[PDB]
Amino acid sequence: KGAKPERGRFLHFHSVTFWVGNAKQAASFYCSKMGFEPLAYRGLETGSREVVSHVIKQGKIVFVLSSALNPWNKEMGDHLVKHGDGVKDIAFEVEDCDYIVQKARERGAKIMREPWVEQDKFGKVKFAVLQTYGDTTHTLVEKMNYIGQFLPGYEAPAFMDPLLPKLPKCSLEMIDHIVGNQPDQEMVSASEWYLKNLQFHRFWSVDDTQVHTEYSSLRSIVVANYEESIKMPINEPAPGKKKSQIQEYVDYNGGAGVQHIALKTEDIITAIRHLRERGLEFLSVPSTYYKQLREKLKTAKIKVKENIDALEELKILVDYDEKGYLLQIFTKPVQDRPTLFLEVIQRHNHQGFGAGNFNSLFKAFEEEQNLRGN
């Protein structure tokens, strides 16, 4: 949706690396309650004596849970005391890594790790780490004739949970978008980091055409690579009807970081029905939200293929324009700090993110409080 970069390409999201206090229990949690399955493992049993990593997978989504094996680890320890459990690195699978790293250096980005190559019998892979907002980093993955299962240096998982095969499939397929919350007046600079250093462009959608700040208490700029396969909204607090939840994140995260990861699915009724069966908790939606959605769809230009009675019981939200609609629902925070959560989304010819639900939910709670009093 802009100009074309001469060299390099960002294929898609490769993986999301979490830095958690207990990688064993973290990988167990995401497998039990979000439909992930063990893929690879790195730890003491494999020769990695300082850092353990549990690799889990569902569809094309790859999560990495990592913890420190020895005491007095400063880098991982400070990150855990500062943020708690949260996202550390967002990986991009790229083509022509050497130009992307050097052109990013020419534009003034901090190269945290110079390009290096790891190898096993299955091929070679090139990596490189750049620093973005807060302590969040971006690792670049370039497969150079690599054929293995995941990456070199990871063996078969340490343990295969026999409970996972008996649990219903959640049908989560790929990562749609990853939102990074920024502190005050840092949305523009953080969004410029990708346009400047990685030659991204601002992704425009129907959300950019409404003033939702009075109901959202946030400002948002969506940034995307050239092919628009990687989309990452960048948020910052804004004044609004209520105190900004972007500020609540920054206060509890200790700075900038990933607010939520969005996972795209093609069957959100099956996905949410099975995720709730596995025990995952989602946001509360009042009954008046679906009382109002039925009246809206009588005058809307589109028809929803999904059953409205099913959406009401599963507490799934809907946002539409004149040409399509999307279905979305958000989990409760996956930790105790009101920081990181996750989102399940299904798209029906709609490139938005649900900004219309800030006004929709405000009207839904408005009738509910109007009922309890008037």
Ligand X SMILES: O=C1CCCC(=O)C1=C(O)c1ccc(C(F)(F)F)cc1[N+](=O)[O-]
C-alpha angle with apex 44: 38 to 45, nearest 5 degrees?
65
| Residue 211 engages a second copy in binding (rule: CB under 8 A) | no
138 is in an annotated binding site: no
- Residue 220 contact among ligand X, a second copy, Co ion, none, beta carbon within 5 to 8 Å by kind: ligand X
| Residue 136 engages a second copy in binding (rule: CB under 8 A) | no
Q: Which two tokens stand for residue 140?
A: 């670049």
- Residue 171 contact among Co ion, ligand X, a second copy, none, beta carbon within 5 to 8 Å by kind: none
Q: What is the DSSP string of 95-118?
A: E-HHHHHHHHHHTT--EEEEEEEE
| Residue 220 engages ligand X in binding (rule: CB under 6 A) | yes
Report the alpha-carbon distance of residue 27 to residue 59 in Å, rounded: 16
Residues 224-263 that bind ligand X (CB under 6 A): 233, 235, 260, 262
Q: Which residues pair with 17 in a beta bridge?
A: 64, 89
Q: How far is the CB of 373 from ligand X (least distance, A)?
A: 24
One residue of 10, 14, 15, 29 binding a second copy per CB under 8 A: 29
Burial class (CB in 10 A: 0-12, 13-18, 19+), 371: exposed
Residue whose structure tokens are 């083509």: 95
| Residue 28 engages a second copy in binding (rule: CB under 8 A) | yes
Buried b (16+ CB within 10 A) or exposed e, 217-241: bbbbbbbbbbeeebbbbbbbbbebe
DSSP letter assigned to residue 292? H
Size of the site for ligand X (CB under 6 A): 17
One residue of 55, 262, 280, 329 binding Co ion per CB under 5 A: 262
Nearer to a second copy, 30 or 127 (CB): 30
Residue 172: which residues within 8 A CB-CB, separation 6 or more? 34, 35, 58, 59, 61, 263, 264, 265, 271, 344
| Of 107-115, 137-145, 210-218, 278-286: span binding a second copy (CB under 8 A) | 278-286
Q: How far is the CB of 161 from a second copy (least distance, A)?
A: 4
Q: How far is the CB of 224 from a second copy (least distance, A)?
A: 31
Q: How far is the CB of 16 from a second copy (least distance, A)?
A: 16
Report the alpha-carbon distance of residue 369 to residue 367 in Å, rounded: 6
Q: How far is the CB of 301 from ligand X (least distance, A)?
A: 21
Q: In this structure, is the dihedral angle defined by the CA atoms of residues 109, 114, 115 and 119, taken in order, positive or negative?
A: negative
313 is in an annotated binding site: no
Nearer to ligand X, 17 or 357 (CB): 357
Nearer to Co ion, 321 or 343 (CB): 343
| Residue 123 engages a second copy in binding (rule: CB under 8 A) | no
Q: How far is the CB of 73 from a second copy (least distance, A)?
A: 7
Q: Which two tokens stand for residue 286?
A: 């009042």
Size of the site for a second copy (CB under 8 A): 49
Q: Which residues pair with 345 in a beta bridge?
A: 264, 328
Q: What is the DSSP string of 304-336?
A: -SS-HHHHHHHT-EEEE-SS-EEEEEEBPPSSS
343 is in an annotated binding site: yes
Q: How far is the CB of 259 from Co ion (least distance, A)?
A: 9
Number of C-beta neighbours around residue 298 at 10 A = 6
309 closest CA partner among 325, 298, 293: 293
Report the alpha-carbon distance of residue 54 to residue 42 in Å, rounded: 7
| Of 156-164, 208-216, 237-245, 290-298: span binding a second copy (CB under 8 A) | 156-164
| Of 7-15, 111-119, 328-336, 365-373: span binding a second copy (CB under 8 A) | 328-336
- Residues in contact with ligand X by CB under 6 A are 177, 179, 216, 220, 233, 235, 260, 262, 317, 330, 343, 353-355, 357-358, 361
- Residues in contact with a second copy by CB under 8 A are 20-26, 28-29, 32-33, 43-44, 52, 67-73, 77-78, 80-85, 159, 161-164, 252-254, 276-279, 281, 332-338
Q: Residues comprising the binding site for Fe cation?
A: 177, 260, 343
